[PDB]
Design a protein around this ligand. Structure first.
Ligand SMILES: CCC1=C[C@H]2C[C@@H](C(=O)OC)C3=Nc4ccccc4C3CC[N+](=C1)C2
Ligand SMILES: CCC1=C[C@H]2C[C@@H](C(=O)OC)C3=Nc4ccccc4C3CC[N+](=C1)C2
Lengths: 314, 314
């Protein structure tokens, strides 16, 4: 039948409400002592609507590890913490950086429009924070209680996930987290913002980039000038409020074989943060690379970007 | 392309190795305090190849609950502990009986031929047993440690799942479980055995019943007289060895709108158990009912069978 959004080969949204997910990587079940990596993972409930895949690496000491909270991307509308595309990345990252991984399973558009994802990821972060100083209720993860170092909490995301992390950092700034937990550092791989710049995006890229915000938040107050998509809008929260001490922004130049056009947008964002009076450590990493190579880890450039993100965790 | 097995609408196995399962029930993610039932569930690893959905109901006292280990059926080759068909059943059963649920995610044929499922379910049962007297390593479930009553352990399955439970009971008999854990009671809902009787199965029913054993264990030693499918074969293990004190066998008369033909097979099985010198409590429940009604819970006969299984747990 007719479609509203034909975003082949990623997603089709039909006039009749049907959603075909063309890029849906297979489910990967929980595993103990993964042969390749020694990582173990489990899928745990946070609420009746929010869950997470929790990861622990091969253990040596009693020693506590940084906590790496990941928010997957893909259009606000695709994939899962539980499917191989993002799971394979987080698994390898956990093995390499020796962290407790918490990959959030948040509700996807169009079935659950924004701000569902924002609410879910905030609820999940507060859930992580709620374990501080518990050395237990049925919802509490013993991996986080026993091995999570709340002095080294990181929050990371890609594409719309990085947009969620942005909005979560603003919120962590205004509201604070349970137990006085502070986010030490955050990572945005391929930020997802929409900002008017002096050079217009090309017609095709504008359509295939802005569509995700349009289908995920059709009734957004201010549309693509909503502060949650445009972080320098008239009514936007002060970036000085960002609730982390360290921030890594990683930029790429290609979406598969398509030239990316977010250079100007991300430049305005970074200039705004630097001009804000946020007195944190800013790290930018700008690669001639495909967005996808970070996750697949088949190419040298993919491995370089992986190692750059790994270096941000100490 | 050409197929080896066309079991539309459930599974197609192609000459070129491809496996289509088009009508698999949807995945249902972990949830805390389910609005309908108050049950919570999580997906936890047992090994690098075996996982389980663990269920806990709304909690009142500190009081310990029976442990209900479930082994889903569907052809040795379909569905999942994590998909709605079996999950919805186990969820409702947990709410009604107030038990710790452990629904085993075992490897499916044809990707993992038998005896993979048997090995996986044995490993899962030993994993459950390994929690006895722990009031902990990263693989141990705090729900089982805190709320699991090892004096009231039940092992239950349907269709090929019931075949797995049969073979697991024989094994529990020969090998014993960690910590001296004994299975108190077991349930076979719609047993899956192949036994020669005096009345031949009809052509169509024989094909659509035996196909699951043939595709799951091609060239099993003895074929359909393999002791693991035919529990009264010449070389079959003694049924006196069954490692439970109580057994419920529940029989039905219909597969959807198709007359079932396992009455004679299940009669031979039950007569053999009764003649074995197994000194346990045997319960048989024979309904004029559709196999499917237990899981869907839409009909009065479905609710009757549900309540019969619930009565077996005390
Ligand atoms: C033309 C802009 C564009 C962006 C890229 C980054 C990001 C995304 O959603 O960006 C907004 C995605 N991550 C995925 C991971 C897996 C399947 C799809 C995606 C997308 C959407 C498709 N895409 C096109 C990729
Ligand atoms: C005509 C014989 C026959 C048996 C029935 C019982 C059982 C099964 O595998 O029994 C052998 C199934 N449970 C399912 C649950 C969900 C999808 C399919 C099944 C099957 C296979 C289809 N079928 C055919 C149902």
């Amino acid at each position: 039948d007719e479609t509203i959004w034909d975003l082949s080969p990623y997603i089709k949204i039909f006039k009749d409400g049907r959603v075909e997910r063309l890029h849906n990587s297979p489910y990967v079940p929980p595993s103990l002592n993964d042969p390749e990596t020694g990582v173990s993972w489990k899928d745990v409930p946070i609420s009746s609507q929010v869950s997470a895949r929790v990861y622990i690496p091969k253990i040596s000491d009693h020693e506590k590890l940084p906590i790496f909270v990941y928010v997957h991307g893909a259009g606000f509308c695709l994939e899962s913490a539980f499917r191989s595309f993002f799971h394979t990345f987080v698994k390898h990252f956990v093995a390499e950086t020796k962290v407790i991984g918490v990959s959030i399973e948040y509700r996807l558009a169009p079935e659950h429009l924004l701000p569902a994802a924002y609410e879910d990821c905030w609820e999940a972060l507060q859930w992580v924070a709620s374990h501080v100083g518990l050395d237990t209720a049925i919802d509490k993860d013993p991996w986080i209680i026993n091995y999570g170092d709340f002095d080294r909490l990181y929050l990371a995301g890609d594409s719309p996930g990085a947009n969620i992390v942005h909005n979560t950092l603003i919120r962590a700034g205004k509201e604070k987290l349970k137990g006085g937990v502070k986010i030490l550092g955050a990572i945005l791989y391929y930020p997802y913002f929409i900002i008017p710049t002096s050079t217009k995006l090309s017609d095709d890229f504008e359509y295939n980039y802005t569509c995700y915000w349009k289908l995920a938040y059709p009734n957004a107050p201010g549309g693509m000038n909503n502060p949650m998509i445009n972080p320098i809008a008239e009514n936007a929260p002060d970036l000085a409020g960002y609730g982390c001490s360290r921030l890594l922004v990683t930029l790429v130049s290609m979406i598969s074989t398509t030239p990316d056009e977010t250079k100007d947008i991300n430049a305005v964002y970074i200039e705004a943060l630097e001009k804000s009076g946020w007195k944190g450590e800013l790290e930018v990493a700008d690669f001639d690379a495909d967005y996808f190579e970070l996750f697949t880890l088949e190419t040298e450039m993919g491995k370089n970007m992986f190692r750059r993100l790994a270096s941000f965790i100490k």
